[PDB]
Design a protein around this ligand. Structure first.
Ligand SMILES: [Mn+2]
Ligand SMILES: [Mn+2]
Ligand SMILES: [Mn+2]
Ligand SMILES: [Mn+2]
Ligand code: NA
Lengths: 207, 206, 206, 207
């Protein structure tokens, strides 16, 4: 049974880059909904699995097929937002300070500088044509190389792709403050990105 | 735990429209693969579910998300092929005979004729740009109306959509016999379509 | 070269159901974005088509493929919003009044009532897990039957699926006013749906 | 107007890894079909594009949206198969011989060995749940790092993702010889992969 995680900061702590009113809605409404949806979907599948064991019909298999969409969507919603809060921090807790160590080294070697990586990421965020996410990732299958990937809806990066920084591009993540001006939001959010958490994820090679 | 279903006919019973060499591989290899994949996926779900209970972390959620794909794909593969075998039959069991009853009436009212419905379906089949299926369906949400829908890969029709006739458009369904000539396969298969089974599905809405 | 269509109503005309603030942003910003993107994409096609003619390489084919996403997305955004404004109207223009004629008959015959069709549509709207649309459509390929279709992002209904009512489920369509309570928005919008335009679309079959 | 490309080898030249029967059908039927489809779709779009100039209506935009699906699919079909033939060669023409130069250096640095890259690719190919492709690519956006990407149907890798080796995982690519044993096909094809063409693409950073 999953639960809304504790936040490391107060709702209004990322102002002026992200408003407290957005954070409160985003966390108490949107994230809680994925929490509830995920627990419900997992419950429903456990129930369908028990039904399939006694009556392994295509009819019942068809029912399982129907709920896995909810497992994926709500599971992703749960996961992506958890990652999101943990890679945000107020300036007082180091938000917006550049990474150090191995991650900083890989960033410079692959993209030239942190500024270029961020510009690439903002291009990707702007390129999400619908709801979705951009993730700075470490790819474990090609020697641990950095990349920036987009996902849609609540799809997430799995397998060898370890998320280092997740940035939410759903309209609910910025609309009350930025309205249509999503590029202003993408630029502003880096001021409160927690690159210490990114570095920790990079070093661990897991989340 | 699912298994391959009983067939109502022998592998060679659909000759010459669908070769026995195809049916044998199709059932004993391809369908068996979805059976095994689905059973594995459901087992793995059960294991991840216990893991999630012990540690409900994003990491473990991530693992669960990863296997949903296989549940969907192999579950669809299992379900779609079960449908397929049940709506195929040799002529000796009524394959290729036109439907009667309420289904026949609905077909004529909506499409003009069975011939016109079949042509529409062959157009949908030819329009699958990849691996996939066409389904003639009854839509329970809009008053029980017939439609033809395409799916890709092992996606299937769910919700208010009741499959009446499933036709496999994956290349493995025809390649040994027809190779690139998929339209020849789409045309030939209607000689062994079991419309009695479609009519039963239509009447039951299940 | 496309442009924003003229609106038949002032930005604040759909209050209280849809905020004038939302309509103004939705039209002057969001719809404009799609107009700009589509014009840009069609210009690029034109340039790449000429390039491909002179040099029909896989390299240039690859470039042509790369712009198709923009054509589809912005083309969809352009088209869907045009449909949307045309099927909305203030109560003073007859918004929210039930359809009549053939459409009204088809709705009663297939769904039982207008309320049942609306209920089904709201279910499809709530079912969009991401950004998207629901369309009440008339299907030209199954004898002209009504159905409700979900799309994601700016995907739209084409070919035999004729849109009668388009409803936007992107968060920018409701968030300033309803925030997370999208179900409240889906319920409210029917008060300003232009069923007269829906009936016109149904009769024209385009 | 695109045309079927010239092949560098005879239909039967890749036996016994891929039969002459397959190559003949694959090239003269399947590839040709995408050639014809792509030419048709581009002509149709040009036609609608000219109409849209005079009638810039939602109706006409809707018609163009329908056609872009065919441009993408047949365009991809044309492109992927052109890449495919160019990265296959008989053993007499160097097929199956390991890459050298910068490409070989990047492979060992990122994957450990060619064999590890090949195994990863075979895992990706087996993971295509439907029709599709695997590509070994050079990613120009992350400092030119190698990766392996899956696509479905005739989707392809565009922009910063430069295809180095394309491997076809559609059933028509192997069924007549391998039937359901696709893993055997994925394993065998490397014996006739042209790594010299892969190296040229890697060096040029384009196709
Ligand atoms: Mn969010
Ligand atoms: Mn099959
Ligand atoms: Mn909109
Ligand atoms: Mn092929
Ligand atoms: Na509100």
């Amino acid at each position: 049974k999953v639960t809304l995680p504790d936040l490391k900061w107060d709702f209004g702590a990322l102002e002026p880059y992200i408003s407290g009113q957005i954070n409160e809605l985003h966390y108490t409404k949107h994230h809680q909904t994925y929490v509830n949806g995920f627990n419900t979907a997992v419950d429903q599948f456990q129930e369908l699995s028990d039904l399939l064991a006694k009556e392994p019909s295509p009819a019942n298999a068809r029912k399982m097929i129907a709920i896995q969409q909810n497992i994926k969507f709500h599971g992703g919603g749960f996961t992506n937002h958890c990652l999101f809060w943990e890679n945000l921090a107020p300036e007082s807790q180091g938000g917006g300070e550049p990474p150090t160590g191995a991650l900083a080294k890989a960033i410079d070697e692959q993209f030239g500088s942190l500024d270029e990586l961020i510009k690439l990421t903002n291009t990707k965020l702007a390129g999400v044509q619908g709801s979705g996410w951009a993730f700075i990732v470490k790819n474990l299958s090609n020697g641990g190389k950095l990349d920036v990937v987009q996902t849609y809806n609540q799809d997430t990066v799995t397998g060898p792709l370890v998320p280092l920084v997740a940035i939410d591009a759903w309209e609910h993540a910025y609309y009350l403050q930025y309205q249509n001006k999503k590029a202003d939001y993408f630029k502003a959010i880096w001021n409160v990105v927690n690159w210490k958490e990114a570095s920790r994820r990079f070093d661990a090679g897991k989340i």
